[PDB]
Ligand binder design. Structure first.
Ligand SMILES: CC(C)c1nnc(NS(=O)(=O)c2ccc(CCNC(=O)c3sc4cc(F)ccc4c3Cl)cc2)s1
Ligand SMILES: CCCCCCCCO[C@@H]1O[C@H](CO)[C@@H](O)[C@H](O)[C@H]1O
Length: 263
């Protein structure tokens, strides 16, 4: 029964995401992306590197540390869009009141984004523009503060999370468990959410058995990663709040602006 449930969430993930850990992990290994590590290479990428969201559709250019930020902002907004469509793809989720759905997405989306970030990450950098390019970690560290400080706790996490060696069928269930969380403030029908969450967590355990049989303590380890993700997002909202006051000239997307609102 839970085999059918797991299959459905996997089909909802594959049907909804531009990049599987499978596709990403091949690109970062072999059988090539254009490495962005300085101003010259960013300009080079800006010129002839296939971005889904074009440069003309970005906020008015200000500076380098800000342009990088705006490009990142776009993908976060598009991942919020994939995740909403993935959440709706679960028929149990798309049954709750539209505001209860918005509550789960408002608080769960950033947790999910960071868990999925580990798929396109390695110790030295991350994939960009559907794997067309590869941005270096040192380049991002070389940007001005506060911008150089944003992506660092994400990388620390991503590396640790990648050690668990999860596949796309594990992530579909992991993300589902992240979205459908009863601990979200402003939830109306908490028993119904808590209900669905239980089904997912049951499904996640029995799938981790069939997919990772020799894996010691995987399920409680992922339950801890879920908690760690909650902290990383608390830390993240806090940073973007500082960026909102300090960087008055940088434009924060209202959707993300609303996510960090009462966090
Ligand atoms: C980068 C630093 C100033 C930040 N600004 N916002 C942050 N948010 S975040 O939570 O850490 C976060 C949120 C979502 C992701 C996934 C998407 N990332 C991308 O697609 C990126 S980064 C980058 C740098 C480039 F030159 C060119 C393109 C490019 C692209 Cl594309 C990563 C990090 S980090
Ligand atoms: C508080 C913010 C979190 C809410 C997430 C909203 C983002 C989802 O935006 C989605 O865009 C799609 C196509 O353009 C549509 O088909 C959907 O109806 C829509 O909800």
């Amino acid at each position: 029964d839970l085999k059918a449930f797991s299959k459905h969430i996997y089909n909802a993930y594959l049907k909804n995401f531009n990049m599987t850990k499978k596709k990403a992990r091949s690109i970062l290994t072999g059988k090539a992306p254009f490495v962005i590590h300085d101003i010259e290479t960013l300009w080079q990428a800006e010129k002839g590197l296939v971005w889904k969201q074009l440069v003309n559709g970005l906020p008015p250019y200000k500076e380098i540390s800000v342009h990088v930020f705006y490009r990142c902002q776009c993908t976060t907004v598009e991942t919020v869009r994939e995740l909403t469509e993935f959440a709706k793809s679960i028929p149990s989720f798309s049954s709750l009141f539209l505001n209860d759905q918005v509550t789960l997405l408002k608080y769960g989306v950033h947790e999910a984004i960071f868990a999925m970030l580990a798929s396109i990450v390695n110790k030295d950098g991350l994939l960009v523009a559907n794997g067309s390019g590869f941005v270096t970690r040192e380049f991002l560290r070389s940007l001005r503060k506060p911008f150089s400080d944003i992506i660092e706790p994400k990388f620390e996490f991503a590396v640790k999370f990648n050690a668990l060696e999860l596949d796309d069928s594990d992530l579909a269930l992991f993300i589902a468990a992240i979205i459908l969380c009863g601990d979200r403030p402003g939830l109306m029908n908490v028993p119904r959410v808590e209900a669905i969450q239980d089904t997912i967590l049951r499904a996640l355990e029995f799938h981790l058995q069939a997919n990772h049989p020799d894996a010691q303590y995987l399920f409680p380890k992922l339950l801890q990663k879920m908690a760690d993700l909650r902290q990383l997002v608390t830390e993240h909202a806090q940073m973007m709040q500082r960026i909102k006051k300090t960087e008055t000239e940088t434009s924060l997307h209202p959707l993300l602006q609303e996510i960090y609102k009462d966090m």
